[PDB]
Write a protein that binds this ligand. Structure first.
Ligand code: MFB
Ligand code: MFB
Ligand code: MFB
Ligand code: MFB
Ligand code: MFB
Ligand code: MFB
Ligand code: CA
Lengths: 314, 314
C-alpha cells in the first residue's frame, strides 16, 4: 500500500460530481472525516487538508451538483440524522440546512440525492430509509426542508440510486430511483410531471446481493426519450451495468469491472450520443494499494477502460 | 427481516468463547455497542440490555476465555487504542486495564487474543497491527500490560487469528497466530516453550482476498501432537477451512459454507477425536434476515451441518 491509501476507509461511501470533465469525488477516511479529491487536468487533494466535514464511521456518502457552481454532500450524523455539507461557488463550504430538520433515519439507511433537472432554481430531492424500512423523499424548494413522497418498503439497508432529467416535450423534471426489495430484486420507481409517481415498481434485476451498492445516472434527455445507466455490485464481486436506451428499454446487463467484496460505487456522466458522448466515470474499490479508490472510464474514443489506478491521496 | 436482526451491524466483528457447549458470542450493534448473546441449553440475550461496552463502529471484536470463569473481549476505541472488557465470576463485567496503557494501533488493525493454555494463572497475549503495519504482541502476566514480541510486517489491515495449546510432553504454552502478508498469502507464525518464536513464516494459503477475515482454533493437545483449524473468506464468498491434523501437518483445505460479501468469522471448539468429538462452531453473516449472525456446526454424530440460523436477538 501507500500512506495515503491507508487513510481511505475500506468499503468507504463514495460519491462524485462534475461539470463536464471537471471532477469531484468524496470519500470517508479511517477517522470518519469526509474528504474531497479533485480532477482539473490532473488528480489532486484528498488529504486531511481537504476535509469538508465529519460523519459517523461507515456512513453512506452521496452527492449531487449543478455543474460545480452548487455542490451538496449527504451523510449521517452519529445520531442517525440526515446532514448536508454544502458548497456554493464564491462562498466555499459550509454546513447545510438539512441538519436542522433532524430527519431521523434507520442506522443502516443509505442516501441518494439529486438536483431536479431543467430548471436553474435550486430544487433538491434527497432519498433515505426510515426505521420502518420505507423509502422517504425529502424536498428543498426554496422555503425549507420538508418530507416529500413516501415510496414505501424496501430491503433494510438497501442501496439507493436516483437521477433527474427533463424531457424536452414536457415542462417539468422527471425522476427515477432504484433500490432493493425484501426478495432481493433491484427495482425502479419513477416520477414524471404529468403523471406524478407511477404506482408500479419495475424490476431491473432479478436477484442481487443483499444491501448491494446501487448507483445511477442519465444523459441525452429528448422528447419522451432518455438514456439511463444503473450499476450495482453482484455476487461475482464485480460491478454490473444495466442499460436503458430509448426504444430498447431495459435491454442489457453485464459485468464491467472487478471490485472488492462490499465495495461502494459512484457514477457520473456528461455529454450524449449526439455530440461524441456520453462520457461515464465510475468510482469504487478494487484492491489497488489495498484500500485505494479506483476509476473506470467510458468514452467514445476508447470505450471501456480502467482510469486512474488510485485516486488522491493514494 | 426482524426488528431484532436489524440491530446487528452488517459486517460486524464477531468473537466467541465457550466452556464445552456453553457458549458466548460477541458482536457489535448498529450504535456501536458490543453485545453478548448466550447459549445455555438454549440461545438467548443479545438485546440492548446485554451491552458490555462501546467501541468504534466497525471495530474488530476478539474474545478469549478460561472456560466461562474469566472472559476477555478486545475492541478499539474511537482513538484507535486497544481496549478490554473483562468478566470474572463473582464480579461481573468491567473495563480491564488494557485501555489504561493507551496502545495506539493502525486505525485499520484487527485483533486476536488468547489466554495461555495449561496454567491457572491469567496470562494474556493480544496481537494487533501498529501504524507501521507490523504485528505487535501485547502481554499481561499480572504485572501490568506491556509490549511483547513484534512479529514482522503484514498487509495493512490483515485479519489476525490466534490459538494457544499445551502439548502434554511440555512445561508451558505454545502459540500459533495467522495473518496475511503484502503478497496476499496467508501465513502462520509459531511459538513453542522450548524454542521461542520460530523465525520462519509458513504459508497456509497462496492467495486470499485482501484484508480477509481470518480465525483459528486448536484442540486435542497430546504428546508432541495438536489439531488446528484455520478459517477465511475466500474470493468465492465462502468461508474456507485449512486443516492441521497431527501426523500430516497442513494437508487439506476447501470450502465450508457461503457468507455475505466481506463477512467476519469466529470459531470455537471443544473435545477431541479420542473422546467422540471434537465439536466446532463458526459464526458469520451469510445473509439470514439480512444482517443476523448464523452458525455452523461440526460434531461426530452428524458432521457438517448449519446450526442456529439466526442468533439472538434476531
Ligand atoms: C480520458 O480519461 C480521463 O478523463 C478524465 C475526466 C478523468 O476521469 C481521468 O482520470 C481519466 O483518465
Ligand atoms: C478548485 O477546487 C474547488 O472546486 C470547487 C467547485 C469545490 O470542489 C472546492 O472544494 C474546491 O476547492
Ligand atoms: C413539489 O413536490 C413534488 O416534487 C416532485 C418533483 C416530486 O418530488 C414529488 O414527490 C413532490 O411531491
Ligand atoms: C448440535 O448443535 C447445537 O450445539 C449447540 C451447543 C449450539 O451450537 C446450537 O446452536 C447447535 O444447534
Ligand atoms: C449466567 O450468564 C452470565 O454468564 C457469564 C459467564 C457472563 O457471560 C455474563 O455476561 C452472563 O450474564
Ligand atoms: C513472558 O513473555 C513471553 O511470553 C511468551 C509465551 C511469548 O508470548 C513471548 O512473546 C513473550 O516474550
Ligand atoms: Ca478545464
Amino acid at each position: 500500500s501507500t500512506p495515503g491509501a491507508q487513510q481511505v476507509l475500506f468499503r468507504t461511501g463514495i460519491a462524485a460530481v462534475n461539470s463536464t470533465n471537471h471532477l469531484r469525488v468524496y470519500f470517508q477516511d479511517v477517522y470518519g472525516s469526509i474528504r474531497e479529491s479533485l480532477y482539473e487536468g490532473s488528480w489532486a487533494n484528498g488529504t486531511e487538508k481537504n476535509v469538508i466535514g465529519n460523519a459517523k464511521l461507515g456512513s453512506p456518502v452521496a452527492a449531487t451538483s449543478k455543474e460545480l457552481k452548487h455542490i451538496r454532500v449527504y451523510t449521517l450524523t452519529e445520531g442517525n440524522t440526515l446532514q448536508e455539507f454544502a458548497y456554493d461557488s464564491g462562498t466555499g463550504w459550509y454546513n447545510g440546512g438539512l441538519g436542522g430538520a433532524k430527519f431521523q433515519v434507520a442506522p443502516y439507511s443509505c442516501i441518494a440525492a439529486v438536483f431536479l433537472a431543467g430548471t436553474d432554481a435550486l430544487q433538491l430531492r434527497i432519498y433515505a430509509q426510515k426505521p420502518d424500512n420505507t423509502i422517504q423523499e425529502y424536498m428543498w424548494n426554496g422555503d425549507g426542508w420538508k418530507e416529500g413522497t413516501n415510496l414505501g418498503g424496501a430491503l433494510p439497508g438497501t442501496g439507493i440510486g436516483a437521477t433527474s432529467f427533463r424531457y424536452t416535450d414536457y415542462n417539468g423534471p422527471s425522476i427515477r430511483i432504484w433500490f432493493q426489495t425484501d426478495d432481493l430484486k433491484l427495482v425502479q420507481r419513477a416520477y414524471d410531471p404529468h403523471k406524478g409517481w407511477y404506482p408500479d415498481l419495475v424490476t431491473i434485476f432479478d436477484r442481487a446481493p443483499p444491501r448491494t451498492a446501487i448507483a445511477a445516472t442519465s444523459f441525452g434527455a429528448g422528447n419522451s426519450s432518455i438514456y439511463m445507466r444503473i450499476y450495482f455490485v453482484n455476487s461475482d464481486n464485480t460491478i454490473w451495468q444495466v442499460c436503458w436506451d430509448h426504444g430498447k428499454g431495459y435491454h442489457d446487463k453485464g459485468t464491467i469491472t472487478p471490485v472488492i467484496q462490499g465495495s461502494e460505487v459512484a457514477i457520473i456522466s456528461w455529454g450524449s450520443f449526439a455530440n461524441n458522448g456520453p462520457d461515464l466515470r465510475l468510482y469504487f474499490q478494487n484492491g489497488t494499494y489495498i484500500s485505494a479508490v479506483s476509476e473506470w472510464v467510458w468514452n467514445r474514443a476508447h470505450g471501456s477502460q480502467l482510469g486512474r489506478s488510485a485516486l488522491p491521496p493514494a
